Amino acid sequence: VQLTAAQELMIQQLVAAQLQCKRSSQQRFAHFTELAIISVQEIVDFAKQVPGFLQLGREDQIALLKASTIEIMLLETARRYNHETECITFDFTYSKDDFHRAGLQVEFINPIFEFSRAMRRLGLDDAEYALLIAINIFSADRPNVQEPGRVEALQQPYVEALLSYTRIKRPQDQLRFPRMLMKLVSLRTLSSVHSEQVFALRLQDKKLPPLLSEIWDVSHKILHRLL
Amino acid sequence: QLTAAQELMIQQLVAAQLQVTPWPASQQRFAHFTELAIISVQEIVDFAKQVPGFLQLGREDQIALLKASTIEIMLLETARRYNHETECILKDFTYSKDDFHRAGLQVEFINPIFEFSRAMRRLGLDDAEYALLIAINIFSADRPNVQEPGRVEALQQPYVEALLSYTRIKRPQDQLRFPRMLMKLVSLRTLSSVHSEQVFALRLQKLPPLLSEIWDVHKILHRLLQD
Numbered sequence: 472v473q474l475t476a477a478q479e480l481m482i483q484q485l486v487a488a489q490l491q492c493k494r495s496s497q498q499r500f501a502h503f504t505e506l507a508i509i510s511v512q513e514i515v516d517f518a519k520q521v522p523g524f525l526q527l528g529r530e531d532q533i534a535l536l537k538a539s540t541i542e543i544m545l546l547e548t549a550r551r552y553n554h555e556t557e558c559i560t561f562d563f564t565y566s567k568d569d570f571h572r573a574g575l576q577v578e579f580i581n582p583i584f585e586f587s588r589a590m591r592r593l594g595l596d597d598a599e600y601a602l603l604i605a606i607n608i609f610s611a612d613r614p615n616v617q618e619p620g621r622v623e624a625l626q627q628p629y630v631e632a633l634l635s636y637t638r639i640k641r642p643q644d645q646l647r648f649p650r651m652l653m654k655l656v657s658l659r660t661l662s663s664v665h666s667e668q669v670f671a672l673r674l675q676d677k678k679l680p681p682l683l684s685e686i687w688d689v690s691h692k693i694l695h696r697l698l
Numbered sequence: 699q700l701t702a703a704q705e706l707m708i709q710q711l712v713a714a715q716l717q718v719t720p721w722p723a724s725q726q727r728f729a730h731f732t733e734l735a736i737i738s739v740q741e742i743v744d745f746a747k748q749v750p751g752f753l754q755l756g757r758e759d760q761i762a763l764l765k766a767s768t769i770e771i772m773l774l775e776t777a778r779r780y781n782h783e784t785e786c787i788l789k790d791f792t793y794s795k796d797d798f799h800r801a802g803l804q805v806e807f808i809n810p811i812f813e814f815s816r817a818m819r820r821l822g823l824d825d826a827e828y829a830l831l832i833a834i835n836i837f838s839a840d841r842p843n844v845q846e847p848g849r850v851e852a853l854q855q856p857y858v859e860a861l862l863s864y865t866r867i868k869r870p871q872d873q874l875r876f877p878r879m880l881m882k883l884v885s886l887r888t889l890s891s892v893h894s895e896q897v898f899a900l901r902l903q904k905l906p907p908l909l910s911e912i913w914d915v916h917k918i919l920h921r922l923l924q925d
């Protein structure tokens with residue numbers, strides 16, 4: 472019938488916390504990694520602000536962040552993708568050739584753009600994006616998760632809220648919410664391709680910095696301090 | 699409520715769906731399981747022919763969908779016949795966790811399949827829900843090397859629509875069942891990712907020609923489609 476006042480507060484808390492998330496070939500690669508570093512730090516600070524993340528064991532908190540960080544970034548990329556200019560903004564704006572010039576393969580870049588256009592067609596507002604990020608963080612099937620049951624339980628409220636929210640925004644379009652959730656399936660494959668991209672960069676004498684190598688290369692000391 | 703036109707479709711899908719070497723020694727046990735995998739792959743291609751619209755797509759795409767889907771369909775089938783009373787997972791070739799471990803499968807791969815199966819069991823899926831979930835899995839637009847993603851997404855929508863409508867009728871009060879079912883598709887991508895690592899580990903300690911076509915890093919797969 473309608474959103475429950477308890478959810479309205481929770482949604483509104485999530486979007487507000489999110490809006491505070493703001494700074495304005497090897498050299499090109501080394502540039503992008505510093506952008507990745509800043510965004511990772513913003514995500515961990517955001518993850519602290521989500522209800523219940525703090526409650527979990529650090530080992531699980533790490534396990535969720537390692538896997539989630541690439542997918543949250545790809546969601547953020549999709550949110551600020553401009554279909555009028557074909558540029559992705561981090562107001563650090565970049566085109567497809569800028570990503571190619573830094574050593575990223577075309578098999579990885581083109582799908583991110585295709586993913587972004589598909590996300591654009593769904594017409595997601597900030598509340599939908601915020602809830603999608605919460606659902607993404609609390610994924611029970613991430614590797615090396617000690618307490619999958621607790622993680623699944625923390626996810627349910629955000630899936631419930633997202634269901635209720637999508638029903639109010641577009642009552643007639645029932646298939647929007649299923650299609651949104653099916654983008655989570657696409658983020659897993661794009662995360663899988665990203666690991667191949669990392670390895671392909673190593674071949675081109677392009678190795679990751681210390682924070683990013685903790686999460687993406689294959690004792691997360693850097694990641695503990697921020698938590 | 700459901701449209702009777704869908705109903706025939708569901709009923710056709712469920713009906714279509716309902717239709718070896720000695721087990722001892724590790725290599726013999728492994729060689730046993732591969733022959734079970736061979737038979738099940740052949741059953742899936744015959745099933746894929748019976749799904750409406752699969753035949754209409756180009757062979758190159760038909761291959762691309764089957765390569766990726768086969769592991770996920772098998773894991774769905776494993777979950778369907780997982781027994782929580784006995785912890786055991788062909789017609790009645792029953793196996794326990796130690797049987798899988800004895801054949802050289804690592805525990806990092808076995809335990810998640812069981813955890814996945816228990817999670818699937820908690821959802822309480824009937825044969826219609828399983829059947830529709832399999833159809834949705836086959837028609838995934840973001841599989842690698844797909845020439846016609848638009849047509850694949852279009853063939854998927856009716857099954858997602860049917861699954862939505864079906865789940866609403868079966869349990870009107872439990873709204874979160876359908877979202878949780880679709881989120882299992884996300885879990886199948888990671889389990890497919892782990893399965894590729896499992897295959898490589900084993901080579902380290904080699905698959906039969908048919909599987910190696912689908913899983914190792916296409917003549918058999920064409921003949922089954924050409925019939």
Ligand SMILES: CC(C)(C)OC(=O)N1CC[C@@]2(C(=O)Nc3ccccc32)[C@@H]1c1ccccc1
Nearest residue numbers: 503504506507544545548570575579580583665
């Ligand atoms: C190269 C490093 C390791 C820093 O970055 C990545 O490997 N990636 C992976 C995801 C990423 C993103 O967020 N947008 C986007 C668009 C196209 C390709 C790659 C990406 C990000 C990324 C790429 C470029 C700039 C910032 C982040």
Ligand SMILES: CC(C)(C)OC(=O)N1CC[C@@]2(C(=O)Nc3ccccc32)[C@@H]1c1ccccc1
Nearest residue numbers: 731732734735772773776787798803808811893
């Ligand atoms: C490596 C080989 C080819 C043997 O098999 C697989 O790689 N797999 C991967 C998926 C599989 C299955 O279908 N059920 C199940 C349950 C536990 C573990 C593994 C599986 C299957 C599989 C395993 C055992 C028997 C038949 C199929």
